[PDB]
Design a binder for this molecule. Structure first.
Ligand SMILES: [Ca+2]
Lengths: 11, 141, 148, 143
């Protein structure tokens, strides 16, 4: 299961 | 793999707006000729569209409305939780309004609804439509 | 290999609205620096966009209207997208104006299953007085192949 | 790979419109619960979105104006404010909202998309604004 989160990392 | 999407609308059942009450959207089949549900991996719940797959979505809506004023937004999961960029407004025959197109990250279960946030007078929503379409899978690492 | 799309517009040829008469859209190349037709597997027919590929599409439009406000002779117009014939208006595609100065209206974005041969047009469905359409634009873009 | 896209907006810092002056768009994270940048292979430069990848894009915008005579007309511009894009006009003539149409356009690396006022009567108070850029295709075939 894939979900966006506050731990999601961007460039 | 197909993008997730949904189109939920009301063309034939007027409703009087009330503050923070999601608008009813009973229909998902807009083509009058080849009438099929325009729903893929979303759920039309009766008063909005629920996401099933995480992604970046475009969301937008329309309304047809008959001093008096009406202000509307899209909300995320609960009616007070309004989304920036999604405002529409009528201040005074039938008047049509259209939101912009908002790009936003949504997770499985997120429920997008159209909500009134300011009303003066008798605001009759003659028609409404909500558009949700996936742009991208999640773009995080 | 790419999604079907089309963008058809009228930027400087004003036209008077007529009931159920598709609006003229003579241009397909909006970039002022790198002028190319924004057309892929659709046809711009002069007053709308014809579909060649079955799929789910987003459709929308915008209009620029100039109205005289003569108090005792108000002008108004209502417009929709139509599918194949002018009467066949698409839900969610309405715009409306009522009476000075160029004003713009935009539709929402409608998601719809379309089929080869289908013709998307902008039609006036109600008019009071003379309505001058200074400019118009029609947007068609495939979002999916047919879903099952 | 993933489409290029960007969403740049202003919801919390009103600005007065100035002729041919790009509107300020400081925010890229519209989700109030999971706040993440809705940017992929574009750059939000503070007053617009810069393209990094050739392709066909959908572009559009919104405004909210705090009206008190007052009128404005706005367009999207390509690279410099006078270089307006056909089909991108909006006009205003309590808070009122306006939304543009959706313009499909071929864009190239370095192209800078901005919202510009082209006509102003009186003072026009921009309470909010938002710019939407999303790639729909790689560059296509044409003559
Ligand atoms: Ca719009």
């Amino acid at each position: 299961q894939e979900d966006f989160s506050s731990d999601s990392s961007f460039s | 793999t197909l993008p997730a999407f949904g189109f939920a609308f009301n063309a034939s059942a007027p409703q009087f707006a009330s503050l923070f009450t999601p608008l009813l959207l009973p229909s998902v089949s807009p083509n009058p000729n080849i009438t099929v549900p325009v729903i893929n991996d979303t759920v039309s719940v009766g008063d909005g569209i629920r996401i099933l797959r995480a992604g970046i979505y475009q969301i937008s809506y329309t309304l047809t409305i008959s001093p008096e004023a009406g202000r509307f937004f899209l909300s995320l999961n609960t009616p007070a939780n309004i989304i920036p960029g999604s405002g529409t407004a009528v201040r005074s025959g039938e008047v049509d309004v259209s939101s912009g197109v908002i790009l936003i990250n949504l997770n499985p279960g997120d429920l997008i609804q159209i909500v009134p946030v300011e009303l003066i007078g008798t605001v009759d929503i003659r028609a409404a439509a909500l558009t949700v379409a996936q742009i991208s899978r999640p773009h995080h690492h």
